[PDB]
Every structure is written in C-alpha cells, then in structure tokens.
Design a protein around this ligand. Structure first.
Ligand SMILES: CSCC[C@H](N)C(O)=S
Ligand SMILES: [K+]
Ligand SMILES: [K+]
Ligand SMILES: [K+]
Ligand SMILES: [K+]
Ligand SMILES: [K+]
Ligand SMILES: [K+]
Ligand SMILES: [K+]
Ligand SMILES: [K+]
Ligand SMILES: [K+]
Ligand SMILES: [K+]
Ligand SMILES: [K+]
Ligand SMILES: [Mg+2]
Ligand SMILES: [Mg+2]
Ligand SMILES: [Mg+2]
Ligand SMILES: [Mg+2]
Ligand SMILES: [Mg+2]
Ligand SMILES: [Mg+2]
Ligand SMILES: [Mg+2]
Ligand SMILES: [Mg+2]
Ligand SMILES: [Mg+2]
Ligand SMILES: [Mg+2]
Ligand SMILES: [Mg+2]
Ligand SMILES: [Mg+2]
Ligand SMILES: [Mg+2]
Ligand SMILES: [Mg+2]
Ligand SMILES: [Mg+2]
Ligand SMILES: [Mg+2]
Ligand SMILES: [Mg+2]
Ligand SMILES: [Mg+2]
Ligand SMILES: [Mg+2]
Ligand SMILES: [Mg+2]
Ligand SMILES: [Mg+2]
Ligand SMILES: [Mg+2]
Ligand SMILES: [Mg+2]
Ligand SMILES: [Mg+2]
Ligand SMILES: [Mg+2]
Ligand SMILES: [Mg+2]
Ligand SMILES: [Mg+2]
Ligand SMILES: [Mg+2]
Ligand SMILES: [Mg+2]
Ligand SMILES: [Mg+2]
Ligand SMILES: [Mg+2]
Ligand SMILES: [Mg+2]
Ligand SMILES: [Mg+2]
Lengths: 135, 58, 78, 94, 116
RNA sequence: UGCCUGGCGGCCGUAGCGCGGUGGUCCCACCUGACCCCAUGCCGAACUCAGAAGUGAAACGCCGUAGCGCCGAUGGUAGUGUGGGGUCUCCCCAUGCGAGAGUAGGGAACUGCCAGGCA
RNA sequence: UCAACGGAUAAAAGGUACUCCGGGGAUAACAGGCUGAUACCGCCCAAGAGUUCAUAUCGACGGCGGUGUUUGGCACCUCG
RNA sequence: CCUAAAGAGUAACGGAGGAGCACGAAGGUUGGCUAAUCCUGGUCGGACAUCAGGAGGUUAGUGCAAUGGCAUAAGCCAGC
RNA sequence: GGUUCUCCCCGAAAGCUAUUUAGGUAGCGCCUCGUGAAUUCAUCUCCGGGGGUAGAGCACUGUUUCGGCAAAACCCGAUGCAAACUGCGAAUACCGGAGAAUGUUAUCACGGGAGACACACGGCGGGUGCUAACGUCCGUCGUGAAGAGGGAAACAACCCAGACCGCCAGCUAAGGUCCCAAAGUCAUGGUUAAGUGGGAAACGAUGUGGGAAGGCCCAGACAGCGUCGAGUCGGCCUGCG
C-alpha cells in the first residue's frame, strides 16, 4: 500500500478539495484513466484498482500510477469522547476533476478499455477512459 | 451641472454596514424615496456600490 | 489519552506602524520587525531590536535599492 | 487544405469567454509576425472534428476572418479538464 | 581579485559618510600614481582634485608613486580646497590602509589647513 | 569637439556567465627589488615600501555572437469583492478586479561629475 | 517564598452507604431527540472456488446504499 | 512556528518545539578576513584528519528552540 | 424565588484581560445622561503604501512516479503533492493623503448612572469531529436575543420587510393566481407518462427529445429464407424519465 516513507509532520489539517486537477494529460503511456469526479482515493483503493488492472492485461505492457496517497487521515477510537487529534489510520490522495489516475502502454486499446473498466469498479470516483493526444 | 434621480428599490435590512453607509451617503431614507444628485464619478461610485437596490433615472 | 501540545507565546504586535506617505514626528516607530526585513534609509534609524524609527519629521517612503532588491524605508524631510 | 472560419471577438475576458463556450463557440488568438494579435471566435464542433486528425497540428492551416485568409499553425491548445472540448487555441502566423 | 576585495573594504565607511552627509576627501592609490578628490555630499559632484598624472605637479617630482609625491598631492588638493573655501571634510581611505603614502597625503592635507 | 583610460555617483541581471576577436604612447594590471616604514598565528602570497628592465599572458576594459541565465507580451485559465442562483463537502450567473505557469518575442545595457592621454 | 508562576494565611490531608442545606436539566446515570462512526440488512465489480463452468451455491481485493434493534458521539427536553 | 481568512489581534484537553540560562568576553572599538559540499593529486592516512588546485556561491556559521535576519556581514581572526 | 400606577425619548451585552476564577467580581469594550473641543467621523472617487492569504509553482525544505546516463544514487529529463515549502502572487481588507455630495454630530475628550461578561441559528473562511450531529472551537457578516407584519402547511435564528395612532382607499416585496383560499383553468413554443413532479447512491437498461460526426447503401445494404427491395448499423455529447 502506497504511503510516504517519511514526513515532516504526522498529522494534517482536514483542508478542502476545491479546483480542477493538474496532470490532466496522458504523459507517460498511451491510455489513461481520468477522474471526472472529486474525492479522496485511499491507498487501499489505489492498490485494489491496480491489481485488477494488472491482472486484466496479464502483466503485459506497462502501468503508471500518477496519484500518490500523501495525506494522512486520523480517526478517533470507538467509545471515545477533544483530548487531542486522533491517530493516523490511513492515507489518501485528493482527487479533482481531470486528474489522470493511471496510465497504460503496450497493449491494444480494446484490452486497455477492459482493464480500466475493471479498475474503475474499485474506485469511489467517476472515471473516464482517455488517450494520448499529439498536442 | 447635470443631475440624476436615484430611487431606493429594496430594503436596507440585513445589508452590509458599507451598503447602509452608502445609502446614507446618497441621502436615501426608505424604499421608494427618490433623491436628485449631481452626476459625478463619486456619486456614480456610490450608485455602483448599491446598484442592486437602487434605480437611476438618467 | 492526552496531548503534549497546548503551548504558544503572546503575539508581539510586529509589523508596519506607518505606511507610505504618512507624516511622522522624529522618534516615531515606522516598523517593528525581527531582523531587517526593511533596512534604514535616509533619516531612519535602526534600533537594537531592528525597529526602524524616524530621526526627522517628514513623510515615510518605501523604496527598493541595490542588486539584491532590498527594501529601504526613508523619511522625506517635508 | 484545413480551412477555418472565424469571427472577430467584440468582448473579452472571463464573462464573454464563458458565454462563447455556452453558445458552442470558443475563443482563440492569432499572433506572431509583426502584425498585432487578433482575437477570434471559432465554431466548436467543426474545429473539434478537424483537430482529431493529427495533421491539424503539423500542417499549416488557413483561417478565414472577415474575408481575409490567414495562414497559421496551431501553437497551443487548452482542453477542458475532463470533457472532450476545446477551451482555447493559440495560432502562430505562418 | 584585488580591486573587488578593496571595494568591499571601502563600503562600510563610504555608506557611513553618505549617511552623515559629509564632504569626502577620496584618495586613490596605484603603484605609480596617487590621486585625490574632494567630492560633494550628494556624491555626484567633484569640487577640487589633484594627482601625480597632472603635469603641473608631476614635473616637480622625482617619482610619482612614493611618499614624497603623496605629500605634494596632499598639499595641492588642500590649497585648492581652501581656495574655494571648504575646510571641513572627512577623509576616505577608500579601502587602503591609512599608512605610508595615504597617511602622507592625509598628513600634508591637514598641515595645509583642511580640518580632519 | 570626438575617441580611449582612471576615479566618484546615478541606474539593478534586457545590465549576468559563456564563446569568438581585440587594446599597452599615456593610463591600469601583472611585474622588479625589500636593509628599512609596515607585514605573515609560516610565507614580501596578501598588506606595505623603494623602483620601472620586461609584459599585455592572466586580470581589467572594449567590440561581436541567442548558447545559456534572465526579461516577457497578447489571449485563455485559476482565484476573487458585491448581488443573485443550484443538483450546495462543490459550483454556476450578472458585474467589477484578474494571476501563476506557459507561448510569441526579446535580450549580448543606459547615464552625470572630475581628471588625464591622443587626434 | 509565592511554578496553581496578578502571588488567599508565615503555617493547610482524608472519609461519609449515618448524612444534611442551598442550587442546576447551566451538568452525568434512565427514556426521548439529533447523528449513524459502530451494528444490522441490501446492492455494484468479479479474482477465484464450484470435475468442466465467475454468477446452482459461494465469493477475495475494493466500491455504493438502506434501517434506526446495537455499542457509541452530542448534551436539546425533564434534577420545585 | 502553524491554525490565523496577505495590517494588528484571534479559540479548542488543536498541530509541533523550546525556556526557568550563558558570557569580563561570547561586551566595546579599530584593522583585517569569508563558508558548506564535491571532484583531482598527495608519507603513515583508511569513506572521513592535515596540504595543494578547481568547481561551487553561503546549500555554511550564528552560546542554546523556532522564526525573521545577517556579506557594509549580525559569521571568522587579531590589537587596544 | 418575588419585587405593586402611567406615558414619552434613547437603548445594550452575552467580548477581552485578571481572578482559589469559571453560573461571582473588577478594569476595558458595548448603553444612557451631561459638558466641551474639530468640517471630527462615515460612504464614494482619485492618489500614496506595506503585505504573502486564494491561486499557482517546485529553485529551496520535505514528499512522489517513470525514464535517459554511470561508480543502481547524483548528473540530464518528464510528472504530481504541502497548515507548519516559496526563485511567484491576486481579489478584498487595512493605514495615510486629497476631493465632492450626503448624513439623525454619527468622531474624540471629560464627567453622572448603568446593564452585561450562559449566547443561538444562518451565510462565508477555517480548526476539531466521520467535510457525522439542532456537535464543538475561532474569524467575519446577518437575523433572533431585545422585532411585530407577509412568505416558507404548521416553523425564535431562513426569504421579504423594520409596527407613533386611525381609515370598509391605493401601489408593491418575498411568495403566488383549478377548489379549500386573494389573484391567469393567461399567451406562445418545447419536454415528461413516471402521479416523475411530490425522498436517495454506485450501478443497470432497444424509455423518449435534441445535437455533432462516422461505417454500409439501387454495382441491392440490415432482418427473415444465390433469393426479397430503402434507409440502416453502433458508439459520442446532451434534456427529461
Ligand atoms: C468525537 S467529537 C466530540 C468531542 C470529543 N469527544 C472530544 S472530548
Ligand atoms: K492561581
Ligand atoms: K459504611
Ligand atoms: K431529573
Ligand atoms: K570584543
Ligand atoms: K575584540
Ligand atoms: K467587567
Ligand atoms: K459614561
Ligand atoms: K520541490
Ligand atoms: K458564524
Ligand atoms: K434588529
Ligand atoms: K406524486
Ligand atoms: Mg483554505
Ligand atoms: Mg507567535
Ligand atoms: Mg464572474
Ligand atoms: Mg492576461
Ligand atoms: Mg504572467
Ligand atoms: Mg494566576
Ligand atoms: Mg437537596
Ligand atoms: Mg441541557
Ligand atoms: Mg441518553
Ligand atoms: Mg442513543
Ligand atoms: Mg452547547
Ligand atoms: Mg424528554
Ligand atoms: Mg417537549
Ligand atoms: Mg412539576
Ligand atoms: Mg495577521
Ligand atoms: Mg486579514
Ligand atoms: Mg474576538
Ligand atoms: Mg430606537
Ligand atoms: Mg493553495
Ligand atoms: Mg464569567
Ligand atoms: Mg462566556
Ligand atoms: Mg460564540
Ligand atoms: Mg462553516
Ligand atoms: Mg450549537
Ligand atoms: Mg454543523
Ligand atoms: Mg436574556
Ligand atoms: Mg419576525
Ligand atoms: Mg411570521
Ligand atoms: Mg402562517
Ligand atoms: Mg396591483
Ligand atoms: Mg380564488
Ligand atoms: Mg391555458
Ligand atoms: Mg413522488
């Protein structure tokens, strides 16, 4: 599960998630899965979608994960009432509309579409299949 | 030389302090109240600030 | 559980006290600062805590001089 | 061979630009050479189909604006972040 | 580099004199020559000057870049300054040690009647 | 009057590095000595003094060259004050303000005082 | 010495189910409320299991909801 | 220091760290000086000691946290 | 806990700081009465300012993905992320100056009298919490508090709007106009067949409207069985279901 090796700080303000994404182009591969919705992707979701995607292409071609879960999310234990910020439980990437989540190369488009369809079913955010443009 | 007629069209209740001060600066006192003012950039700036609650007769 | 945080210091009310064009008497503090974010120009002194103060009556003037683009404050004798 | 029709823009800035795109057009700019920049409107669907072909970015294009023809190359394109639409194109005078 | 290292040495004092708003007596020294200038407070206006490149002074001297030449230039610049009527100046050693030729120039300027 | 050189200011990278060429009569630099004035936590390297055989190599200055650094529109985009609206974790509309990044393009600086040499 | 750091006196621990008074729904325990993390009940994707065969029966990794039986959160009602 | 909404101020049993000193020089002044790191060569000497040159340009230093500063140095050395 | 006649004018606060203090109290802030001194104060326009927020960016501090070169890091590139990153950087806000118009003198000082120091919800910017709570803690504006009237079925805090008194006059605001119940069974053009409207998601599906391309097509396509004779196929965007 993706996670920063180290961080300056353990805990982060909730913050907000406004705006449109940077990294909206297929930069590395030929085909991309792009976020159309807004939300958070946990490390577990990123991994689950990766596994489905990889299996679907039978470990042929190459897959880039463009998103990294670098935001720590805390939670308070059950039956606790205050008394300080909770403990870090998991990590997320903030997603905005347009963010390319995954790229893939060295497979037919037909297979890429299938793999990304399987991946998209693991994600809480609405996605769309995209292709590399010349400009 | 030229004057303009300004009329208050909406209430001042619940408006920002600045807006209330602007109506006071124009001399508008109540809904429907019309005043005649010299047409200057200073007056136009005031009208602009509260344009959503005044109408101007040129 | 408990917290190990919960501490802070009093706010020190730093910053610019007299902005550009303001007329000041000699002695008047122009800026309170930690270190010289602004430097003393003409008719301005720098105190031991890097407070910039007027050494003459006049108008405050901010200006950028030198290759580093350092911010100077000076008093235009008026 | 690629020919484009273009009006000259009356209004500019955020409000005007967003109104264009709501009316299925989009803004664009022609610059380069010694002539001053020229701000134009384009029909979206027409140009969207053209630029799908990869020759649009390589070839020299013609922009017919107020009768006059102008030879240009597509310099830069701003796409919509997720929808298949164009927000803006830069054309450099060829 | 030597000149840049000297400009560094001269900055503190020069910035200070600018702040005080003093009429400077700026000295420049080379292996062969020594110069002198009385520059006005604004800093973009030379009032008087003297040097061993000037033929009026150089003709009287054995060598131009020695203590005795500096003594001559010191006398020269001071007399011309008192002619215009300046008197009160601040010496600016311009990054050179106040020693030898520079000291010699300065001493001669004092004896002549400049007040520093 | 013009050119070149030095000094002191005004002007802060469109003024900086690089690359190519170029200057020594004066000026400047290195350079020649050092017992001394003075100097090295060792050293005449530097500082300093006494000099003028050599040299424009280095340094410094001047001219060319986009190769960089750097500067940089127009348009669009982001954000946003006020008013209004929605499907309200976020947006849209009217109006005003409007970046950052990037693109075209540029860039190989400009200017006063004093002094000296030369024609 | 005043660190409980604007320092009650120089000098300052406990028990009360034997209890008592003034008060408070300004504040807990019951029940109601708001919430729904948790709980419970569904669904989406389908790796795989199922002799073969994803979907007879199951269903990993992940996703989306419903309910208001749970454990809770909050402290809005009630301490004449 | 952040939360703090580009003047000041601004809460929570919010997120992070420090203090309860030191120094007759580590103060004053005058004169001078300029770092880290890496590369190349060199007795013992090694990844790293000291020497030389180059690149680099403050990525060092600042009595002790962090922030703002610092080359005219506020950093380093000496005289008085 | 209770505190007894009337009318008129103005009219808070639920904050900061300190407190064996926290439901108490004190100074200050906010109210009132009085006295005094300024074209004092406010709104707008123009002018002079500082900024490091939003946004952005990635040289720096950290973090992140993939490549090209090498004793598999740097160097050479591409790509993201940041409350405690900044080689950038708004809108607003704030300070100062000038000018007009307008304003209940609204500013400042001193003095007499206070009350108040449990706030609530709504909007916007946030911390906390589960971007849970009619939750909690700040900033800022509004309303309630201390505010009636109309609207939102009913509904302190939302929308419209500020009640000196009287009228069996009139015009409007939000919101409305088939009947309950005042006013269009109004006009023109569309959409929906679900009582959707009048409760909700991933996701599913020849529902249906609009728009732009593309493939095939009287050299006979698609469906049914070489035969039969005109439009058809399968995706995209989009409205309503
Ligand atoms: C769980 S959010 C409510 C407040 C919290 N119990 C602290 S103390
Ligand atoms: K105490
Ligand atoms: K007992
Ligand atoms: K009770
Ligand atoms: K000392
Ligand atoms: K000393
Ligand atoms: K009080
Ligand atoms: K009073
Ligand atoms: K970075
Ligand atoms: K609020
Ligand atoms: K009110
Ligand atoms: K219905
Ligand atoms: Mg924010
Ligand atoms: Mg602080
Ligand atoms: Mg707008
Ligand atoms: Mg622009
Ligand atoms: Mg720009
Ligand atoms: Mg205390
Ligand atoms: Mg009792
Ligand atoms: Mg209660
Ligand atoms: Mg209960
Ligand atoms: Mg309960
Ligand atoms: Mg409460
Ligand atoms: Mg009850
Ligand atoms: Mg009840
Ligand atoms: Mg009872
Ligand atoms: Mg502040
Ligand atoms: Mg602010
Ligand atoms: Mg406050
Ligand atoms: Mg009243
Ligand atoms: Mg940001
Ligand atoms: Mg209290
Ligand atoms: Mg309170
Ligand atoms: Mg409050
Ligand atoms: Mg909020
Ligand atoms: Mg509450
Ligand atoms: Mg809430
Ligand atoms: Mg009350
Ligand atoms: Mg009411
Ligand atoms: Mg009502
Ligand atoms: Mg009613
Ligand atoms: Mg009517
Ligand atoms: Mg009726
Ligand atoms: Mg009809
Ligand atoms: Mg219904």
């Amino acid at each position: 599960m993706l996670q920063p090796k180290r961080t300056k700080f353990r805990k982060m303000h909730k913050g907000r998630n406004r705006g449109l994404a940077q990294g909206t182009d297929v930069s590395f591969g030929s085909f991309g899965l792009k976020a159309v919705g807004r939300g958070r992707l946990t490390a577990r979701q990123i991994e689950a979608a990766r596994r489905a995607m990889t299996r679907a292409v039978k470990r042929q071609g190459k897959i880039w994960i463009r998103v990294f879960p670098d935001k720590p999310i805390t939670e308070k234990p059950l039956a606790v009432r205050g008394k300080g910020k909770g403990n870090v439980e998991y990590w997320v990437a903030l997603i905005q509309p347009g963010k390319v989540l995954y790229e893939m190369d060295g497979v037919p488009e037909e297979l890429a579409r299938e793999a990304f369809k399987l991946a998209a079913a693991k994600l809480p955010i609405k996605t769309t299949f995209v292709t590399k443009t010349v400009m | 030389a030229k004057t303009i007629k300004i009329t208050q069209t909406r209430s001042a209740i619940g408006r920002l302090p600045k807006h209330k001060a602007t109506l006071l600066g124009l001399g508008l006192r109540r809904i429907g109240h019309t005043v005649e003012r010299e047409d200057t950039p200073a007056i136009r700036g005031m009208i602009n600030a509260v344009s959503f609650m005044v109408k101007v007769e040129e | 559980g408990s917290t190990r945080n919960g501490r802070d210091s009093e706010a020190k009310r730093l910053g610019v006290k007299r902005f550009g064009g303001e007329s000041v008497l000699a002695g008047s503090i122009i800026v309170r600062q930690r270190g010289t974010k602004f430097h003393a120009g003409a008719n301005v002194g720098c105190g031991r805590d890097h407070t910039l103060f007027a050494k003459a009556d006049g108008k405050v003037k901010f200006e950028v001089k030198g290759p580093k683009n350092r911010k100077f404050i000076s008093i235009e004798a008026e | 061979m690629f020919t484009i029709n273009a009006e000259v823009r009356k209004e500019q800035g955020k409000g005007a630009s967003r109104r264009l795109r709501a009316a299925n057009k989009f803004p664009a700019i022609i610059y380069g050479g010694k002539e001053a920049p020229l701000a134009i409107e384009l029909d979206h669907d027409k140009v969207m189909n053209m630029q799908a072909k990869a020759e649009f970015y390589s070839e020299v294009l013609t922009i017919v604006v107020d009768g006059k023809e102008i030879k240009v190359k597509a310099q830069d394109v701003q796409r919509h972040p997720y929808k298949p639409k164009l927000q803006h194109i830069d054309f450099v005078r060829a | 580099d030597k000149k840049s290292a000297r400009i560094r040495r001269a900055t503190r004092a020069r910035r200070k004199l600018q702040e005080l708003g003093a009429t400077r007596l700026v000295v420049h020294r080379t292996p062969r020559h020594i110069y002198a200038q009385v520059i006005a407070p604004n800093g973009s206006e030379v009032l008087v000057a003297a040097s061993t490149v000037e033929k009026a002074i150089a003709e009287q001297l054995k060598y131009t870049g020695n203590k005795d030449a500096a003594a001559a230039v010191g006398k020269a610049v001071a007399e011309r300054a008192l002619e215009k009527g300046i008197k009160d100046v601040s010496f600016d050693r311009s990054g050179f040690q106040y020693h030898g030729r520079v000291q010699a120039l300065a001493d001669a300027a004092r004896e002549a009647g400049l007040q520093f």
